Amino acid sequence: MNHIKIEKGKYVGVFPDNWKFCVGSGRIGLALQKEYIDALSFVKRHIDFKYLRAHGLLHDDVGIYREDIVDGKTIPFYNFTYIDRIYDSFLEIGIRPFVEIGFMPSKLASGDQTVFYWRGNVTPPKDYKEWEKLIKNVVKHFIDRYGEKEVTQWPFEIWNEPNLTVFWKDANQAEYFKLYEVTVKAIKEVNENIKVGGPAICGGSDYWITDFLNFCYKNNVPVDFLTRHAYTGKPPIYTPHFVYQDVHPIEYMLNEFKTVREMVKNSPFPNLPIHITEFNSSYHPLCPIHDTPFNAAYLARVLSEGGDYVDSFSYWTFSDVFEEADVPRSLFHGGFGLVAFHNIPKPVFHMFTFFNAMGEKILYRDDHILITEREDKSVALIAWNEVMTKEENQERKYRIEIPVDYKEVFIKQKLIDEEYGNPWRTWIQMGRPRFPSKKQIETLREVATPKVTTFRKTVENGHITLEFTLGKNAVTLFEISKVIDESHTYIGLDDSKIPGGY
Amino acid sequence: MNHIKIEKGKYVGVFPDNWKFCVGSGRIGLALQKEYIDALSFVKRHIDFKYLRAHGLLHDDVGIYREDIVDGKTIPFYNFTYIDRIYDSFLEIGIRPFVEIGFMPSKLASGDQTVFYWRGNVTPPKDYKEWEKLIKNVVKHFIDRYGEKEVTQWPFEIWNEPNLTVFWKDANQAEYFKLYEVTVKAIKEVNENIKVGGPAICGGSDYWITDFLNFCYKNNVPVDFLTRHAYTGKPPIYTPHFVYQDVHPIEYMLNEFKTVREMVKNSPFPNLPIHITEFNSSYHPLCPIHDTPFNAAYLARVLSEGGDYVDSFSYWTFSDVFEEADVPRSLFHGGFGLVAFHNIPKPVFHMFTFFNAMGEKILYRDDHILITEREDKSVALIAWNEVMTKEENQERKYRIEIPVDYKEVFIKQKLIDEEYGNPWRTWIQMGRPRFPSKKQIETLREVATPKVTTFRKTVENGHITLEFTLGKNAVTLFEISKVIDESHTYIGLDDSKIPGGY
């Protein structure tokens, strides 16, 4: 039904690598877990993410800020044992931290308000000049351990979602500015080449972006990028074990992206880089939507178009290794992770890997397909089909004419939908086991992979035709490439002489 | 000084393998750490430890006990996500848990009192019958996942050091006896072949052993083994960063072993196995005695002799991965472990591995040397020399006549003292760097190995004579073996034709 004719030689855009700039994570402290490193290693073997963005560098499980008593004095001590082990392991894996400065260490806090099950503290420092010394020592170490050519490649975003009272005492904008100003000026004094930015808010308070940008311009506090989080979840229904959420169409997020690029172009900093340091449909770590093939198909458009607007958009999160809502109580529990425990890829993970196949040169693109040409001049394409309702049009038919100037083509297709690459479904059939056996795990691994099919055909009249129908919530990848047939070189080759009817 | 003549074909005792039955660890929640799994794997490549003993199975970071509110009714939830991953990894490595029931999960607790930096609740359960259901469900889960044959090889130790008020409210003995009865009867109802035991007391309250064994006999309360801890630290000096302690002679601890055996010999269970579930010199996690060559020399006698009295004795702990006194603040910091961070083995580690060379038939044993015969009739021996003070007497000389019925002999010596295998000395030389660099760490690993030297002697009069002198805090191992010289099979063999003066 959707008929598409690609003309020989015409392009319409550049597909950039923004989609794999940065990915999200459970709290920095959780990076100590073997399951985390096993997960991060597995992701990094498949998607060359450049940066990792996680809360809680200054939380007390990481244990940086402590206080010793000598006489009646109270003198600080900065403990780097854990963060060293962590950042080391990031860099050995091949990924750098998107440092998020937060939250408040308990012995520097002014109040007792906390966020999450791990009770990160969200009050301003009782003494702002002792918070200045923490930040400067923390940055100075790093330069000493990792060296400046390395640490200046690390961006520093200041705090998390201050426009919400649950993350920042009273959601006090003025006090958030004092905090941003003290913190970035501590960082810059150690090394001015370190890029910093903010204000890390979620949608629904976009005036914060104008207020924050004016505040940095009127005073002379530096800002080298903007950050903001984008979700699409309508208000949620709660449960002892679940949070259920409806969602806006994915266009609601892409619209939010561009109106944010608009704000920055009318800002005192018209070329500011924008980093969406968190994004997903539902915004709760226990929402089953994250486990489904729907969330793969639904998020796919963001990877196609998101880089038209923002310099990075970081999927929350790479792994279910997460503790914000306590320890998960079931293998499939609605976690943010691209990867469920035991390195079982979710549908969303495979969707991400498909974009490894996109070239820079965009042949075509609408709301539900992306077609690109790689440097070897083979053609690849990714189509999705997110289906929000029982009553919606369920299938999505494509007929695509593709020019090729060679005579024998090889087609490779990877499909994930409700049937293929859907371990959640098998998990359900298995009885929804909360704590499955090894054998159950390995069977979920066997299914947790895209259906892969291959075709060979002769090219007639300088083009080929791909006709295919996406079912409910499918994402698929096609790769079209030239065959240099070598069968002529096999003397006496005759398949018909093989038992088996060949 | 110390002249020894091994008479041909005579033995005394038998050297059993109790020394490697069991080893200790930081709390079970710390087993999620990559650094922890890396250290355990490292230890188990060198010492075949059968069991691993650690606090806090029921602590709330492992997350097992939780509550849900459907109605106003609160019902219980048992979350096995973390504990499954932990015991799975123990089993894959090849070690089993010496299960320690404890401490108290927050939602079952009757009071606010906690132990350690990680705040384990040490009050009894507010409702002993909801404590019983926890035990039943945890053990039934273990059996469901791992199988009857496997879990019934896991011994269950009830609580930890209840004679101390810091580990158990008011050090109430009756309250503990009720806890022990309720817990093990829950255990036994799930499967009566699970070995239970106690009372896991600290030293200095040994009447508890009489009271607890009598209590069980009187009231038909199962007990399949006794447990107790043995340390030797005198009352400590405290510092913002250190705990310093003197120690009794090591004879003091071997005395406690033979003493507690006597009590169970005089009890209604005269054949009770005894497990010394923690031991070390100093009992504090920030006491540098643990990092020194002295502790290796000092602790050697118990490996040599402890098995005469107790069925197991488990060194606290296998690794510095530990949080009882907050996150360690320097590479060497006095931690309990055989192994420091980044797998840098301490002298005590090497001392242990030496005992892999002891055969079962003992040829000769005193306070400072053990000489054994392996099955191929080669002879091996470990000698040590702990020097407690600068006065004392610092060197120990040895002259050992070993008979052999073969003419050509090969001797291999391994030595650790203050000069060799002492990464602590090098770290001091380096500046005591709290957070060393990779190059520093790698240099420390280069020196953290025994000195290894080899010898060839033609035997005169059917015996060889080992002559060596132990420096201060030294441990050494020799191995004596037959040589079948194959040099006659090399035709034209002449080293004198190799440039180099050979």
Ligand SMILES: O[C@@H]1[C@@H](O)[C@H](O)OC[C@H]1O
């Ligand atoms: O921490 C994240 C928070 O910032 C956002 O509101 O929702 C996702 C959470 O996990």
Ligand code: NA
């Ligand atoms: Na379409």
Ligand code: NA
């Ligand atoms: Na988390």
